[PDB]
Amino acid sequence: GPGMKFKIDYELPLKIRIKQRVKHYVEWQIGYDMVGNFIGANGKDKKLYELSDIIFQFFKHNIILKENLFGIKNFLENNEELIEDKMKINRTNFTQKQVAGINFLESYVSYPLLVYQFEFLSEIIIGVQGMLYFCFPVHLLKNINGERNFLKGYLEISRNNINIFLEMLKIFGILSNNHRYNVLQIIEFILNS
Amino acid sequence: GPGMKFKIDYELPLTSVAGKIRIKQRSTDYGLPVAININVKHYVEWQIGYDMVAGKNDGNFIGANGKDKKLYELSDIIFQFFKHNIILKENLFGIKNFLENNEELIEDKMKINRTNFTQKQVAGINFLESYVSYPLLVYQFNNNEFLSEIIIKEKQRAIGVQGMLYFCFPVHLLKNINGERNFLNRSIESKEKGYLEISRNNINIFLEMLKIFGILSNNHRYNVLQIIEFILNS
Protein backbone atom coordinates (compact mmCIF):
# COMPACT_ATOMS: atom_id res chain seq x y z
CA GLY A 1 0.00 0.00 0.00
CA PRO A 2 0.98 3.64 -0.51
CA GLY A 3 1.74 6.25 2.10
CA MET A 4 1.04 5.16 5.66
CA LYS A 5 0.19 1.65 4.38
CA PHE A 6 3.73 1.11 3.07
CA LYS A 7 5.47 -2.01 4.35
CA ILE A 8 8.74 -3.85 3.74
CA ASP A 9 9.06 -7.62 4.16
CA TYR A 10 12.83 -7.68 4.57
CA GLU A 11 14.24 -10.99 3.35
CA LEU A 12 16.65 -12.48 5.90
CA PRO A 13 18.54 -15.66 4.93
CA LEU A 14 18.68 -18.21 7.74
CA LYS A 15 25.96 -11.26 8.77
CA ILE A 16 22.90 -13.24 9.89
CA ARG A 17 23.45 -15.64 12.79
CA ILE A 18 20.88 -17.67 14.73
CA LYS A 19 21.64 -18.03 18.44
CA GLN A 20 19.72 -18.71 21.64
CA ARG A 21 19.97 -17.47 25.22
CA VAL A 22 11.32 -19.19 22.04
CA LYS A 23 14.81 -18.41 23.37
CA HIS A 24 16.18 -18.38 19.80
CA TYR A 25 16.81 -14.98 18.21
CA VAL A 26 18.21 -13.44 15.03
CA GLU A 27 21.66 -11.84 15.30
CA TRP A 28 21.82 -9.27 12.49
CA GLN A 29 25.13 -7.47 12.08
CA ILE A 30 23.19 -4.85 10.14
CA GLY A 31 24.97 -2.22 8.06
CA TYR A 32 23.97 1.03 6.41
CA ASP A 33 26.06 1.27 3.22
CA MET A 34 27.78 -0.81 0.55
CA VAL A 35 30.51 -0.23 -2.01
CA GLY A 36 27.13 5.15 -5.86
CA ASN A 37 25.17 7.56 -3.66
CA PHE A 38 27.84 9.25 -1.52
CA ILE A 39 31.54 9.30 -0.66
CA GLY A 40 32.33 7.37 2.50
CA ALA A 41 34.84 8.29 5.18
CA ASN A 42 37.37 6.07 3.41
CA GLY A 43 36.80 7.99 0.16
CA LYS A 44 35.17 5.08 -1.68
CA ASP A 45 31.99 4.87 -3.74
CA LYS A 46 29.24 4.05 -1.24
CA LYS A 47 25.53 3.45 -1.84
CA LEU A 48 22.54 3.03 0.44
CA TYR A 49 22.03 -0.46 1.86
CA GLU A 50 19.92 -2.21 4.50
CA LEU A 51 19.24 0.30 7.29
CA SER A 52 19.65 3.34 5.04
CA ASP A 53 17.60 1.61 2.33
CA ILE A 54 14.78 1.15 4.85
CA ILE A 55 14.86 4.78 6.00
CA PHE A 56 15.00 6.07 2.42
CA GLN A 57 11.91 4.12 1.35
CA PHE A 58 9.81 5.11 4.37
CA PHE A 59 10.83 8.72 3.77
CA LYS A 60 9.89 8.29 0.10
CA HIS A 61 6.43 7.05 1.16
CA ASN A 62 5.98 9.98 3.59
CA ILE A 63 5.97 7.85 6.73
CA ILE A 64 9.26 9.39 7.90
CA LEU A 65 8.98 13.18 8.03
CA LYS A 66 11.78 15.38 6.73
CA GLU A 67 11.66 17.17 10.09
CA ASN A 68 12.73 13.92 11.75
CA LEU A 69 15.73 13.65 9.43
CA PHE A 70 16.59 17.31 10.06
CA GLY A 71 16.49 16.69 13.81
CA ILE A 72 18.74 13.64 13.50
CA LYS A 73 21.15 15.56 11.26
CA ASN A 74 21.50 18.47 13.70
CA PHE A 75 21.84 15.98 16.55
CA LEU A 76 24.70 14.12 14.86
CA GLU A 77 26.37 17.34 13.67
CA ASN A 78 26.26 19.06 17.07
CA ASN A 79 27.09 16.02 19.21
CA GLU A 80 30.68 15.42 20.29
CA GLU A 81 30.06 12.43 22.60
CA LEU A 82 30.93 9.33 20.58
CA ILE A 83 30.48 5.76 21.80
CA GLU A 84 33.99 4.74 20.72
CA ASP A 85 35.49 7.43 22.97
CA LYS A 86 33.15 6.66 25.90
CA MET A 87 33.73 2.88 25.88
CA LYS A 88 37.10 2.36 27.58
CA ILE A 89 38.87 -1.00 27.69
CA ASN A 90 40.25 -1.54 31.20
CA ARG A 91 43.31 -3.57 32.22
CA THR A 92 43.93 -4.47 35.85
CA ASN A 93 47.32 -4.37 37.52
CA PHE A 94 49.33 -7.58 37.53
CA THR A 95 48.76 -9.62 40.69
CA GLN A 96 50.45 -12.81 41.83
CA LYS A 97 48.48 -15.95 40.95
CA GLN A 98 49.55 -19.55 41.53
CA VAL A 99 48.16 -22.43 39.46
CA ALA A 100 49.43 -26.00 39.99
CA GLY A 101 52.19 -24.53 42.16
CA ILE A 102 53.50 -22.38 39.29
CA ASN A 103 53.78 -18.65 40.00
CA PHE A 104 52.06 -16.53 37.34
CA LEU A 105 51.18 -12.86 37.04
CA GLU A 106 47.44 -12.40 36.50
CA SER A 107 45.70 -9.48 34.82
CA TYR A 108 42.15 -8.96 33.56
CA VAL A 109 41.26 -7.16 30.31
CA SER A 110 37.70 -5.81 30.45
CA TYR A 111 35.83 -5.00 27.24
CA PRO A 112 32.68 -2.88 27.66
CA LEU A 113 29.42 -3.61 25.90
CA LEU A 114 26.29 -1.52 25.47
CA VAL A 115 22.68 -2.74 25.37
CA TYR A 116 19.93 -0.54 23.93
CA GLN A 117 16.39 -1.83 24.48
CA PHE A 118 13.56 -0.87 22.14
CA GLU A 119 10.74 -7.18 21.79
CA PHE A 120 13.85 -5.84 20.06
CA LEU A 121 17.27 -4.80 21.32
CA SER A 122 20.61 -3.53 20.02
CA GLU A 123 24.00 -4.67 21.32
CA ILE A 124 27.38 -3.00 20.76
CA ILE A 125 30.44 -5.13 21.55
CA ILE A 126 34.16 -4.75 20.92
CA GLY A 127 43.38 -2.78 16.83
CA VAL A 128 39.80 -3.19 18.04
CA GLN A 129 36.46 -2.05 16.65
CA GLY A 130 32.89 -1.65 17.83
CA MET A 131 30.32 -3.97 16.28
CA LEU A 132 26.57 -3.32 16.35
CA TYR A 133 24.11 -6.21 16.50
CA PHE A 134 20.35 -5.89 15.97
CA CYS A 135 18.65 -8.75 17.82
CA PHE A 136 15.04 -9.91 17.92
CA PRO A 137 13.22 -13.23 18.45
CA VAL A 138 13.19 -15.52 15.42
CA HIS A 139 9.46 -16.30 15.71
CA LEU A 140 8.67 -12.73 14.62
CA LEU A 141 9.72 -13.59 11.06
CA LYS A 142 7.23 -14.57 8.37
CA ASN A 143 8.10 -17.53 6.16
CA ILE A 144 8.41 -17.44 2.37
CA ASN A 145 4.64 -17.93 2.15
CA GLY A 146 4.01 -15.11 4.63
CA GLU A 147 3.19 -16.45 8.09
CA ARG A 148 5.13 -16.82 11.36
CA ASN A 149 5.47 -20.61 11.08
CA PHE A 150 9.00 -20.95 12.49
CA LEU A 151 8.03 -21.80 16.08
CA LYS A 152 14.24 -17.63 4.62
CA GLY A 153 12.63 -15.28 7.13
CA TYR A 154 10.89 -11.96 6.45
CA LEU A 155 10.92 -9.10 8.95
CA GLU A 156 7.83 -6.90 8.62
CA ILE A 157 8.64 -3.17 8.71
CA SER A 158 5.78 -0.66 8.82
CA ARG A 159 4.71 2.60 10.44
CA ASN A 160 4.27 0.71 13.73
CA ASN A 161 7.97 -0.16 14.09
CA ILE A 162 9.87 2.18 11.74
CA ASN A 163 11.03 4.18 14.77
CA ILE A 164 13.25 1.23 15.74
CA PHE A 165 15.31 1.82 12.60
CA LEU A 166 15.34 5.60 13.05
CA GLU A 167 16.71 5.13 16.57
CA MET A 168 19.20 2.58 15.24
CA LEU A 169 20.41 5.07 12.63
CA LYS A 170 20.86 7.65 15.39
CA ILE A 171 22.88 5.14 17.42
CA PHE A 172 25.09 4.41 14.40
CA GLY A 173 25.62 8.16 14.05
CA ILE A 174 27.29 8.27 17.48
CA LEU A 175 29.21 4.99 17.31
CA SER A 176 32.40 6.47 15.82
CA ASN A 177 33.69 9.32 13.68
CA ASN A 178 33.65 7.17 10.54
CA HIS A 179 30.03 6.17 11.17
CA ARG A 180 29.02 9.73 12.08
CA TYR A 181 30.46 10.94 8.77
CA ASN A 182 28.81 8.20 6.70
CA VAL A 183 25.39 8.56 8.35
CA LEU A 184 25.48 12.33 7.81
CA GLN A 185 26.21 11.70 4.13
CA ILE A 186 23.27 9.29 3.96
CA ILE A 187 20.85 11.70 5.65
CA GLU A 188 22.02 14.44 3.29
CA PHE A 189 21.40 12.17 0.29
CA ILE A 190 17.92 11.18 1.49
CA LEU A 191 16.90 14.77 2.27
CA ASN A 192 18.16 16.09 -1.08
CA SER A 193 16.54 13.22 -3.00
CA GLY B 1 78.08 -28.27 17.53
CA PRO B 2 78.56 -31.76 18.97
CA GLY B 3 77.57 -32.79 22.47
CA MET B 4 77.35 -29.92 24.94
CA LYS B 5 78.06 -27.50 22.08
CA PHE B 6 74.80 -28.47 20.36
CA LYS B 7 72.58 -25.53 19.48
CA ILE B 8 69.58 -24.68 17.32
CA ASP B 9 69.43 -21.37 15.43
CA TYR B 10 65.65 -21.39 15.13
CA GLU B 11 64.57 -19.46 12.03
CA LEU B 12 61.68 -17.06 12.67
CA PRO B 13 59.96 -15.09 9.86
CA LEU B 14 59.94 -11.48 11.03
CA THR B 15 58.22 -9.49 8.25
CA SER B 16 55.05 -11.58 8.26
CA VAL B 17 51.45 -10.91 9.29
CA ALA B 18 48.50 -13.27 9.72
CA GLY B 19 50.80 -15.91 11.14
CA LYS B 20 52.27 -17.41 14.30
CA ILE B 21 55.04 -14.77 14.54
CA ARG B 22 54.17 -11.15 15.31
CA ILE B 23 56.27 -8.14 16.31
CA LYS B 24 54.99 -5.84 19.05
CA GLN B 25 56.32 -3.01 21.23
CA ARG B 26 56.17 -3.37 25.02
CA SER B 27 54.72 -0.23 26.63
CA THR B 28 57.05 -0.25 29.65
CA ASP B 29 53.71 -4.66 31.35
CA TYR B 30 51.59 -4.64 28.18
CA GLY B 31 52.51 -4.49 24.52
CA LEU B 32 51.00 -3.13 21.32
CA PRO B 33 51.59 -4.37 17.76
CA VAL B 34 53.79 -2.54 15.27
CA ALA B 35 54.12 -2.55 11.48
CA ILE B 36 60.73 1.39 11.39
CA ASN B 37 63.82 0.98 13.57
CA ILE B 38 63.87 -1.74 16.24
CA ASN B 39 64.49 -0.64 19.83
CA VAL B 40 64.68 -2.46 23.17
CA LYS B 41 60.88 -2.45 23.54
CA HIS B 42 60.26 -4.47 20.36
CA TYR B 43 59.36 -8.07 21.19
CA VAL B 44 58.71 -11.21 19.16
CA GLU B 45 55.32 -12.81 19.80
CA TRP B 46 55.38 -16.53 18.95
CA GLN B 47 52.18 -18.59 19.26
CA ILE B 48 54.25 -21.75 19.63
CA GLY B 49 52.91 -25.29 19.49
CA TYR B 50 54.17 -28.66 20.67
CA ASP B 51 52.74 -31.03 18.04
CA MET B 52 51.24 -31.24 14.57
CA VAL B 53 48.75 -33.59 12.93
CA ALA B 54 50.78 -36.29 11.19
CA GLY B 55 50.09 -38.59 8.28
CA LYS B 56 50.06 -42.37 8.20
CA ASN B 57 53.87 -42.54 7.94
CA ASP B 58 55.35 -39.74 10.09
CA GLY B 59 53.35 -40.12 13.30
CA ASN B 60 55.03 -40.12 16.71
CA PHE B 61 52.07 -40.53 19.10
CA ILE B 62 48.27 -40.45 19.31
CA GLY B 63 46.82 -37.34 20.93
CA ALA B 64 43.95 -36.96 23.35
CA ASN B 65 41.60 -36.30 20.42
CA GLY B 66 42.54 -39.68 18.94
CA LYS B 67 44.43 -38.13 16.02
CA ASP B 68 47.84 -38.99 14.62
CA LYS B 69 50.35 -36.46 15.96
CA LYS B 70 54.07 -35.82 15.54
CA LEU B 71 56.62 -33.61 17.25
CA TYR B 72 56.69 -29.95 16.23
CA GLU B 73 58.41 -26.76 17.40
CA LEU B 74 58.58 -26.96 21.20
CA SER B 75 58.59 -30.76 21.45
CA ASP B 76 60.97 -31.09 18.49
CA ILE B 77 63.36 -28.68 20.23
CA ILE B 78 63.20 -30.74 23.43
CA PHE B 79 63.63 -33.97 21.44
CA GLN B 80 66.83 -32.79 19.74
CA PHE B 81 68.41 -31.54 22.96
CA PHE B 82 67.51 -34.83 24.63
CA LYS B 83 68.91 -36.66 21.59
CA HIS B 84 72.21 -34.79 21.97
CA ASN B 85 72.40 -35.60 25.71
CA ILE B 86 71.90 -32.04 26.99
CA ILE B 87 68.53 -32.56 28.69
CA LEU B 88 68.76 -34.97 31.63
CA LYS B 89 66.31 -37.86 31.86
CA GLU B 90 65.57 -36.76 35.44
CA ASN B 91 64.33 -33.43 34.06
CA LEU B 92 61.72 -35.15 31.89
CA PHE B 93 60.82 -37.54 34.72
CA GLY B 94 60.31 -34.61 37.08
CA ILE B 95 57.91 -33.01 34.62
CA LYS B 96 56.19 -36.37 34.12
CA ASN B 97 55.61 -36.94 37.84
CA PHE B 98 54.48 -33.32 38.23
CA LEU B 99 51.85 -33.63 35.50
CA GLU B 100 50.67 -37.00 36.83
CA ASN B 101 50.08 -35.66 40.35
CA ASN B 102 48.75 -32.23 39.35
CA GLU B 103 45.04 -31.51 39.77
CA GLU B 104 44.82 -27.75 39.07
CA LEU B 105 44.24 -27.02 35.37
CA ILE B 106 44.36 -23.54 33.87
CA GLU B 107 41.16 -23.90 31.84
CA ASP B 108 39.35 -24.98 35.03
CA LYS B 109 40.73 -22.21 37.27
CA MET B 110 40.71 -19.28 34.84
CA LYS B 111 37.31 -17.61 34.53
CA ILE B 112 35.87 -15.17 32.02
CA ASN B 113 33.71 -12.70 33.94
CA ARG B 114 30.61 -10.75 32.95
CA THR B 115 29.90 -7.80 35.21
CA ASN B 116 26.61 -6.38 36.40
CA PHE B 117 24.88 -3.69 34.35
CA THR B 118 25.12 0.04 34.96
CA GLN B 119 23.11 2.85 33.41
CA LYS B 120 25.24 4.76 30.90
CA GLN B 121 24.21 7.79 28.83
CA VAL B 122 26.09 8.64 25.62
CA ALA B 123 25.02 11.67 23.57
CA GLY B 124 21.84 11.76 25.67
CA ILE B 125 20.96 8.17 24.69
CA ASN B 126 20.50 5.75 27.59
CA PHE B 127 22.31 2.40 27.43
CA LEU B 128 22.97 -0.51 29.75
CA GLU B 129 26.71 -1.01 30.14
CA SER B 130 28.47 -4.23 31.12
CA TYR B 131 32.00 -5.61 30.89
CA VAL B 132 33.39 -8.95 29.72
CA SER B 133 36.70 -9.53 31.51
CA TYR B 134 39.29 -11.92 30.08
CA PRO B 135 42.17 -13.11 32.26
CA LEU B 136 45.72 -13.48 31.06
CA LEU B 137 48.55 -15.31 32.81
CA VAL B 138 52.18 -14.23 32.42
CA TYR B 139 55.05 -16.53 33.37
CA GLN B 140 58.45 -14.89 33.79
CA PHE B 141 61.24 -17.37 33.09
CA ASN B 142 64.43 -17.19 35.13
CA ASN B 143 65.97 -15.45 32.12
CA ASN B 144 64.37 -12.01 32.46
CA GLU B 145 64.37 -11.62 28.67
CA PHE B 146 61.92 -14.48 28.03
CA LEU B 147 58.27 -14.72 29.04
CA SER B 148 55.15 -16.60 28.04
CA GLU B 149 51.59 -15.27 28.19
CA ILE B 150 48.40 -17.32 28.17
CA ILE B 151 45.31 -15.62 26.73
CA ILE B 152 42.00 -17.05 27.97
CA LYS B 153 39.09 -16.97 25.50
CA GLU B 154 35.76 -18.75 25.17
CA LYS B 155 35.67 -22.25 23.72
CA GLN B 156 34.24 -22.11 20.20
CA ARG B 157 31.03 -24.16 19.97
CA ALA B 158 31.68 -25.57 23.44
CA ILE B 159 31.36 -24.90 27.17
CA GLY B 160 34.32 -23.51 29.09
CA VAL B 161 37.42 -21.50 28.28
CA GLN B 162 40.58 -22.13 26.26
CA GLY B 163 44.14 -20.90 26.69
CA MET B 164 46.46 -19.73 23.91
CA LEU B 165 50.14 -19.67 24.85
CA TYR B 166 52.44 -17.05 23.34
CA PHE B 167 56.24 -17.16 23.63
CA CYS B 168 57.79 -13.69 23.82
CA PHE B 169 61.32 -12.27 23.84
CA PRO B 170 63.05 -9.09 22.60
CA VAL B 171 63.87 -8.75 18.92
CA HIS B 172 67.45 -7.69 19.69
CA LEU B 173 68.11 -11.21 21.00
CA LEU B 174 67.82 -12.57 17.45
CA LYS B 175 70.76 -13.12 15.13
CA ASN B 176 70.66 -12.22 11.45
CA ILE B 177 71.71 -14.59 8.65
CA ASN B 178 75.37 -13.76 9.42
CA GLY B 179 74.96 -14.68 13.09
CA GLU B 180 75.04 -11.02 14.18
CA ARG B 181 72.73 -9.54 16.83
CA ASN B 182 72.45 -6.23 14.99
CA PHE B 183 68.67 -5.76 15.05
CA LEU B 184 68.88 -3.07 17.74
CA ASN B 185 68.68 0.45 16.26
CA ARG B 186 67.93 -0.97 12.82
CA SER B 187 64.86 -1.57 10.67
CA ILE B 188 63.91 -5.09 9.62
CA GLU B 189 64.54 -5.79 5.94
CA SER B 190 61.93 -7.39 3.70
CA LYS B 191 61.60 -11.16 4.17
CA GLU B 192 64.37 -11.00 6.78
CA LYS B 193 64.64 -13.96 9.14
CA GLY B 194 65.51 -13.83 12.83
CA TYR B 195 67.42 -16.66 14.49
CA LEU B 196 66.79 -17.51 18.14
CA GLU B 197 69.86 -19.29 19.50
CA ILE B 198 68.80 -22.28 21.63
CA SER B 199 71.56 -24.02 23.58
CA ARG B 200 72.41 -25.52 26.96
CA ASN B 201 72.29 -22.01 28.45
CA ASN B 202 68.56 -21.56 27.79
CA ILE B 203 67.10 -25.02 27.09
CA ASN B 204 65.38 -25.15 30.49
CA ILE B 205 63.14 -22.29 29.32
CA PHE B 206 61.62 -24.69 26.79
CA LEU B 207 61.37 -27.42 29.44
CA GLU B 208 59.44 -25.09 31.75
CA MET B 209 57.22 -24.17 28.80
CA LEU B 210 56.43 -27.83 28.19
CA LYS B 211 55.42 -28.13 31.84
CA ILE B 212 53.13 -25.10 31.50
CA PHE B 213 51.40 -26.64 28.48
CA GLY B 214 50.88 -29.77 30.60
CA ILE B 215 48.70 -27.89 33.10
CA LEU B 216 46.61 -26.04 30.50
CA SER B 217 43.91 -28.73 30.24
CA ASN B 218 43.41 -32.47 30.50
CA ASN B 219 43.87 -32.87 26.75
CA HIS B 220 47.09 -30.84 26.88
CA ARG B 221 48.18 -32.87 29.92
CA TYR B 222 47.63 -36.11 27.99
CA ASN B 223 49.48 -34.89 24.89
CA VAL B 224 52.52 -33.64 26.83
CA LEU B 225 52.66 -36.93 28.74
CA GLN B 226 52.61 -38.82 25.43
CA ILE B 227 55.43 -36.59 24.16
CA ILE B 228 57.57 -37.10 27.28
CA GLU B 229 57.10 -40.87 27.09
CA PHE B 230 58.05 -40.89 23.40
CA ILE B 231 61.18 -38.80 24.00
CA LEU B 232 62.27 -40.83 27.04
CA ASN B 233 61.95 -44.06 25.02
CA SER B 234 64.15 -42.75 22.18
Numbering used by the authors:
A (entry chain B): -2 to 11, 17 to 23, 42 to 55, 61 to 143, 147 to 154, 162 to 186, 195 to 236
B (entry chain A): -2 to 25, 28 to 34, 38 to 236
From the paper:
The most striking difference between R.PabI and R.CcoLI is that R.CcoLI cleaves the DNA backbone at medium temperatures, while the DNA backbone cleavage activity of R.PabI is very low at medium temperatures; R.PabI only hydrolyzes the N-glycosidic bond of the recognition sequence at medium temperatures. Both R.PabI and R.CcoLI are members of the HALFPIPE superfamily of restriction enzymes. Structural studies have identified that HALFPIPE superfamily proteins are not restriction endonucleases, but rather are restriction DNA glycosylases. However, at medium temperatures, R.PabI acts as a monofunctional DNA glycosylase, while R.CcoLI acts as a bifunctional DNA glycosylase. R.CcoLI is predicted to recognize a negatively charged dsDNA in the HALFPIPE region, similar to R.PabI.
